[PDB]
Amino acid sequence: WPSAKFIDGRVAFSRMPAERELDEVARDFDAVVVLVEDYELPYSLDEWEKRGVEVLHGPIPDFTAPSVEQLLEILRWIEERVREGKKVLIHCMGGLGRSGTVGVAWLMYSRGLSLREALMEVRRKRPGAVETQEQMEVLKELEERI
């Protein structure tokens, strides 16, 4: 699925799949982290279940940061699926800052990367995408705990 950009061998991030795209995406991933809010969702997250995909719904408002504890819980969940041999998709929508934040966090969490190097790696895979200052702050908090 070309919207998905992989950040390691098993974890990717992307924009939101449309409902017509679900059959395709569901054959490429085993689990999905949904970071959009319910007022951004054009379908029920049931549609993933009906296609054999397990879901973690961790809503974050657009342009804002998750809490650091919310971040760590999402990271632990991704790690669980990865350890099971599964491929995981992190998606948000819009400017992509929310999935960008979680993807940078994942590189710090799983590979031990510093924040500044994790930011550089995600930055190159998404030309023109930025994290807001609020998202930068929680990532710094994550670095200070990790």
Author numbering: 2 to 147
Show sentences the authors wrote.
In this study, we report the crystal structures of three forms of Tk-PTP, which showed that this protein forms a canonical DUSP fold and that it undergoes an atypical temperature-dependent conformational change between two forms. Structural and biochemical analyses revealed that this structural alteration requires the presence of the GG motif in the P-loop, and that Tk-PTP has dual amino acids, Asp63 and Glu132, both functioning as the general acid/base residues. PTP proteins commonly share a highly conserved active site motif called the PTP signature motif, which is also present in Tk-PTP as HC93MGGLGR99. This motif, constituting the phosphate binding loop (or simply called P-loop), contains the catalytic cysteine residue (Cys93) that functions as a nucleophile for dephosphorylation and the conserved arginine residue (Arg99) that anchors the phosphate group of the substrate during the enzyme reaction.
The recombinant Tk-PTP protein expressed at 25°C in Escherichia coli was purified at room temperature using a Ni–NTA column and size-exclusion chromatography, which was subsequently subjected to crystallization trials at 18°C. Triangular prism-shaped crystals were obtained, which were used for determination of the crystal structure of Tk-PTP to a resolution of 1.7 Å, referred to as Tk-PTP(form I) in this manuscript. The asymmetric unit of the crystal (space group P212121) contains one molecule of Tk-PTP(form I), in which a central β-sheet constituted by five β-strands [β1(Lys6−Asp9), β2(Val12−Ser15), β3(Ala32−Val34), β4(Glu55−His58), and β5(Lys88−His92)] is sandwiched by four helices [α2(Val69−Glu85), α3(Gly98−Arg112), α4(Leu116−Lys126), and α5(Gln134−Arg146)] on one side, and by two helices [α1(Glu22−Asp29) and α+(Leu46−Arg52)] on the other. The overall structure indicated that Tk-PTP(form I) adopts the typical DUSP fold, composed of a core region (β1–β5 and α2–α5) and mid-domain variations (α1 and α+). Similarly, Tk-PTP(form I) adopts a distorted P-loop conformation in which the backbone amides of Gly95−Gly98 are oriented away from the active site pocket (left top). Structural alignment between the P-loops of Tk-PTP(form I) and DUSP3 bound to 2-(N-morpholino)-ethanesulfonic acid (commonly called MES) shows that the main chain backbone of the residues Met94−Leu97 of Tk-PTP(form I) are arranged differently from that of the corresponding residues of DUSP3. Furthermore, steric hindrance occurs between Tk-PTP(form I) and the DUSP3-bound phosphotyrosine-mimicking molecule in the superposed model, demonstrating that the active site motif of Tk-PTP(form I) is not suitable to accommodate a phosphotyrosine moiety; therefore, Tk-PTP(form I) should have limited phosphatase activity.
